[PDB]
Design a protein around this ligand. Sequence first.
Ligand code: HEM
Ligand code: HEM
Ligand SMILES: Cc1cc(N)nc(COc2cncc(CNCCc3cccc(F)c3)c2)c1
Ligand SMILES: Cc1cc(N)nc(COc2cncc(CNCCc3cccc(F)c3)c2)c1
Ligand SMILES: C[C@H](O)[C@H](O)[C@H]1CNc2nc(N)[nH]c(=O)c2N1
Ligand SMILES: C[C@H](O)[C@H](O)[C@H]1CNc2nc(N)[nH]c(=O)c2N1
Ligand SMILES: [Zn+2]
Lengths: 407, 411
Amino acid sequence: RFLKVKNWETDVVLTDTLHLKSTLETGCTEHICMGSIMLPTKDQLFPLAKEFLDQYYSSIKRFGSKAHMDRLEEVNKEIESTSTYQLKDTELIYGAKHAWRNASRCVGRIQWSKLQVFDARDCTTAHGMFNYICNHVKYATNKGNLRSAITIFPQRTDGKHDFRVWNSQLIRYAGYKQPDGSTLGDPANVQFTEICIQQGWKAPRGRFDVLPLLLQANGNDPELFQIPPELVLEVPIRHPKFDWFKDLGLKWYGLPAVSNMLLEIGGLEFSACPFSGWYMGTEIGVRDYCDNSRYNILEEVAKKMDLDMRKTSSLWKDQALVEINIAVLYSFQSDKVTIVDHHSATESFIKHMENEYRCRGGCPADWVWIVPPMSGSITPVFHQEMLNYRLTPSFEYQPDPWNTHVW
Amino acid sequence: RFLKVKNWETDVVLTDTLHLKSTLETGCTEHICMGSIMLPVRTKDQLFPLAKEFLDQYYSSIKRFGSKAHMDRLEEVNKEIESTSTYQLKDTELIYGAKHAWRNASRCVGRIQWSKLQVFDARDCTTAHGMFNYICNHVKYATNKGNLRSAITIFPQRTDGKHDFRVWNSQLIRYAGYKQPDGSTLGDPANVQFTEICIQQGWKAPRGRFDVLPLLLQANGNDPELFQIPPELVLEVPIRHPKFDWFKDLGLKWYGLPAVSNMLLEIGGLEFSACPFSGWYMGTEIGVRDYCDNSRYNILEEVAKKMDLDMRKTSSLWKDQALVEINIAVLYSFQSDKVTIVDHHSATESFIKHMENEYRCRGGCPADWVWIVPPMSGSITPVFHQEMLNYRLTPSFEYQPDPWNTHVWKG
Ligand code: HEM
Ligand code: HEM
Ligand SMILES: Cc1cc(N)nc(COc2cncc(CNCCc3cccc(F)c3)c2)c1
Ligand SMILES: Cc1cc(N)nc(COc2cncc(CNCCc3cccc(F)c3)c2)c1
Ligand SMILES: C[C@H](O)[C@H](O)[C@H]1CNc2nc(N)[nH]c(=O)c2N1
Ligand SMILES: C[C@H](O)[C@H](O)[C@H]1CNc2nc(N)[nH]c(=O)c2N1
Ligand SMILES: [Zn+2]
């Protein structure tokens, strides 16, 4: 019932008690581990509300105070009457900070308490959503000095009046299938791109076309908007050694901003809650550029380096991978756009885990996600046992809107 | 019940039914995943079911389930257990069992090879000198002058747990490590405590960076005894780089034969506590972990110095650069000396083909993603993108406590 994790490189052992406050299910059983699977009423709501307010009031050192007992009654009264309830600004901010704190797949959580929360619960239309988002984008970008932020749209009511951002991230590139058989731009977004087109978008059909926002307010049909080009900070990619690298025509955007997840706080569900931090270099250079089903540039890079691509055992893919990732980091750093390398980010996460264990009794972490997609064992997280479990407030995946939406 | 796994790069979806035959526990629950934790005498009562389940599996594999030989064999094992408290495997069952423990090993990327395993039956062994001889023959057979052949050698099974056969070494061939008074380590830091044991038992340590350790062998629960593997049987590869001529002057070498000697083989409820097995290396095992782990040889800095990489900031990726060059070197060296090795692209690609065929023909393939994905360049190998299901099938290989912690010293 009380659990130990060991770091096999430093011998530091930590004791986890926080998991006993775990709530949702993992997908694993005593018979089978699903650790590597990507996704394994009025009566329902009040326990969820109480559990949250209890942790909130405990966190400001006022557990069991009149103010605590008063709030619980007020929410109880509101749920019995209205069938839902409203969070105080203080609770909303705490809730959002803790959903990030509890994100077991996130390596950057040392930052969790520095989150700017934009309360957009007063929003009513897609134009309003567009405004809130441009404002979030400009605030977070901060001319390259990135600041973590979330913007929180109104909560689910009856589930037929959902606010949704249809985009998977606020800033992404279009993907197009061509007569060729090959894919131009990002193959991850082919389907979303087509949805844009079929909703009215004027696609320039290039390699790096910033997608428009498809924004759904109050369960209404989603509407298109172009983000002002001037708010999208992009970085041309060059290499500090290879003068040919720039002519691959590679660029990426400065702002990673997840926009398709669901924030659960105290039983309430926020289906539009785009949030953003800054990039770890491997996300672009390893995954975005080198995944076979993404930009898949390894072949083209290895050729310009004139490596022996004859046998996999020359490690040409691995050589090219490192150079691409050097170029990503160098480019962001030369243009003064915040970025972190996987060495620095994973070392910070170890420090963060030690703080969480000492201060809070644990830190849920999903090793499969935390260990970077290159050079795994040379980062400390590789040697770090982790325990994965679900705490709330949380961010959750949710069905893509187009499969759900009644037109 | 069916479970599906998807490969997110290819969209190939596979269906697992084999997990229904899983017995032992994972360590996980509905509330906690322990997927990244390294480690999360029997009675007649529990033994006959374990025997029955195994013999049912054996007899199914040979298409003789429910046959007269099948039924007679169950009755013969039943009686043997009721009379003696244990039972003996037929040679055919031992071979089947050992191959299946490997087939079932969810942390092994090399399992495409599982049906090609040379099983050496050492159950007639009685003494440490006997074990030594068996182990030399395994090494010489598996080494095959560099054309490596997989093999296992199986010493007598556990009886009352007071007469165990144990190989005290964690692998048959490993380099010594010596903690210096100044706190630095000479040789391999992983093997310090074991080296200390060997010296206490009387080993004369040459005290270099790559001293092959002696075998420390325990027969029949007796105190273990030391033996030196004949050096002519220990194939070694000096490590050099195809472009960098200073690489040789680092004085690196490694041995060709990876041979695990501290695991326990369970077959039909019987426990073989001494069962050294060997295959051949995937390059990253040496190049990434043995050479570049912080708690191991730790050569990243020295290599990076010699490459004249920018070392003042981690974001130059100097470690990542040096890591790739070292791994190029290991693969080049082995290939040049005609010693079997596999690179991590070839090995993971082969594993995915193995895994798909297993799903098709067997109904599943338990796999532990944490261990299967290579410790460098993870996502440019196809296994990173493959969902996997981890569960425990028997026959199996299992960890066991280090024998110095449990052994009752006779003197
Ligand atoms: C400040 C810098 C941040 C860094 C360096 C960072 C790092 C990362 C990385 C590398 C991943 C894996 C992404 C992937 O592989 O696709 C991730 C996942 C995640 N992060 Fe962060 N993060 C940051 C900020 C944030 C913020 C501000 C939030 C929420 C407020 C957040 C919530 C999450 C969530 C929910 C996931 C998992 C997403 C999923 O399962 O698809 N992160 N983090
Ligand atoms: C044919 C060549 C083989 C290759 C390339 C190979 C590859 C590997 C690698 C890379 C690992 C992880 C090792 C580590 O990180 O320490 C491993 C684990 C393992 N393999 Fe293999 N393997 C091979 C043959 C075998 C054989 C012959 C057996 C037994 C008959 C075996 C059984 C196991 C077991 C039980 C593990 C888990 C070890 C542990 O948890 O410490 N493998 N394999
Ligand atoms: C906020 C933030 C900061 C930072 N440095 N990086 C990020 C990266 O976020 C993402 C990037 N790319 C994709 C996603 C969404 N991932 C969903 C994975 C998935 C795919 C398919 C099925 C499934 F169940 C789960 C998030 C986010
Ligand atoms: C047969 C074979 C072939 C091949 N290519 N590679 C191997 C590698 O096998 C090992 C190498 N080094 C160490 C081990 C033993 N693993 C121990 C893992 C461990 C460490 C500490 C605690 C724990 F619970 C578990 C196996 C084995
Ligand atoms: C199948 C497997 O779970 C999948 O490829 C995971 C592995 N680890 C990951 N880790 C991160 N950070 N991001 C990912 O998208 C994935 N993908
Ligand atoms: C804590 C963590 O599980 C541990 O470092 C694991 C990670 N994956 C591994 N994978 C392999 N093949 N071998 C290892 O020793 C490890 N170590
Ligand atoms: Zn699990």
